[PDB]
Structures are given as C-alpha cells and as structure tokens.
C-alpha cells in the first residue's frame, strides 16, 4: 500500500485524466469546468474579493499558447492554488 | 464544504508544516525524514532501479542555496514526484 501523501499525488493525476482529451491535454472549456467542479470555495473567495479568476486563468497558464493545458502547465496551476492557501495559513487573505 | 481536491491541497500544506519545526522552512535532515515517511514507495522504486534519490534531492531543490526548503521549493519537489507518477500512468517505470 501507498501512503496518504502518495495517494494524494496520484489523485491529482487521476483528476487530470478526468478532464483530458485524446492528446492528454485539457481544452479551455474543460479546464474551466474542472475549476468550477473541484475548487469552488477557492473561486468563491476570489469573486468575493471582487476577482473573477476564470476570466484569464487559461490565458495565463497556457504558457506555450497551444490553446491546450498539458500536465506541466496543470502542475503550475495547482501550484498557484496551493500557494494561496499557504499564505492564508499565515494569516493572509484568500486570493492575494 | 471542501471538495476532495481542495482538502487534498490543504493536506499538502499540513504535511509541509509538519517538518518546519517552529518556523516556516525545512532543513535538510527534516526534508529527508519527510521523504522517508511520506514517499517510501517512490523511494524504494528508485532504489530498485539503482538510484538513491535522497543523495542530492536537498541540494537539487534548494534553488537559492539558503540551505533550507521554503514552500515554493517544496512545491517544486512535489512537482518532480507528480511528474514521475504521471508518466507511470502512461506505462513507463517509476523513478525515471
Ligand atoms: Ca499549452
Ligand atoms: Ca532554499
Ligand atoms: Zn496523461
């Protein structure tokens, strides 16, 4: 058996593979769907802060402008989210 | 309420702080410990291939050489792991 940590990481890959296309990449409307379905509290925090994260996230995370989100671009996206929570845990405000 | 996804992220942050002692960063011995307790299979997989990941992980990831791993350096570490497991999902062997 694998530790929780290991399990947790595999989960993200499983999550990824729930929204990818044949090419192992996620298109924009799917990426938005993914966001809405899996990080709603995060989003509600940005909108309450007056920020609509979904408006440009795709545009900011598609670093190579291939109109697709690959796993690495995907990793970065999660990175930004984790990061916001971290700052939160040291007091900081959500979406900051 | 929190999705599986959100909780999983918060968990990573919790795991992180477990090894920070009273401050906000992880020393080398603490990181190695974190690795052994939370990624044993990834580790064994590495050893089986004849690779001891622990040998330079700290050195590889302390990008700013302050001889501590801050949350950002940490996320990069977990990226390398996540990335390995991604590839495994496409067949490939652990620790490659
Ligand atoms: Ca892209
Ligand atoms: Ca450092
Ligand atoms: Zn894939």
**Burial environment of residue A38 by CB neighbours within 10 A (0 to 12, 13 to 18, 19 or more):** buried
- CA-nearest of B62, B92, B96, B55 to B76 is B62
CA distance B40 to chain A (A): 8
Domains and CATH numbers, chain B: 1-96 (1.10.238.10)
Question: What resolution in angstroms, rounded to 1 decimal?
Answer: 2.5
Q: Which two tokens mark B58?
A: 């700290």
Q: Which two tokens mark B5?
A: 């996804």
- CA-nearest of A53, A59, A62, A13 to A35 is A53
**Residue A26 β-bridge partners:** A69
CA distance A70 to chain B (A): 11
CA dist A42 and A46 (Å) reads: 7
- CA-nearest of B72, B78, B38, B37 to B57 is B78
Could you give phi then psi for residue A50, rounded to 5 degrees?
85, 20
Contacts of A23 in chain B (CB under 8 A): none
Compute, in angstroms, the gap from residue B94 CA to the centroid of ligand 3: 15
What is the Cβ-side half-sphere exposure of residue A76, based on CA atoms within 13 angstroms?
11
Return the number of other C-beta atoms located less than 10 Å from residue B55's C-beta: 10
A9 interface with B at CB cutoff 8 Å: yes
- Who contacts A77 (Cβ-Cβ below 8 Å, separation ≥6)? A57, A61, A69
A91 interface with B at CB cutoff 8 Å: no
Q: Which two tokens mark A55?
A: 């408006």
CA dist A84 and A95 (Å) reads: 6
Left, alpha or beta for A62 (phi > 0: left; psi -120 to 50: alpha)?
Answer: beta
Return the number of other C-beta atoms located less than 10 Å from residue A47's C-beta: 12
Q: Which two tokens mark B49?
A: 């291939």
- Who contacts A54 (Cβ-Cβ below 8 Å, separation ≥6)? A32, A35, A36, A43
């Amino acid at each position: 058996s694998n530790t929780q940590a290991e399990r947790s990481i595999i989960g993200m890959i499983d999550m990824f593979h729930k929204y990818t296309r044949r090419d192992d990449k996620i298109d924009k409307p799917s990426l938005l769907t993914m966001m809405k379905e899996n990080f709603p509290n995060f989003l509600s925090a940005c909108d309450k802060k007056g920020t609509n994260y979904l408006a440009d996230v795709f545009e900011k995370k598609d670093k190579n402008e291939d109109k697709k989100i690959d796993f690495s671009e995907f990793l970065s996206l999660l990175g930004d989210i984790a990061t916001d929570y971290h700052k939160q845990s040291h007091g900081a405000a959500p979406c900051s």
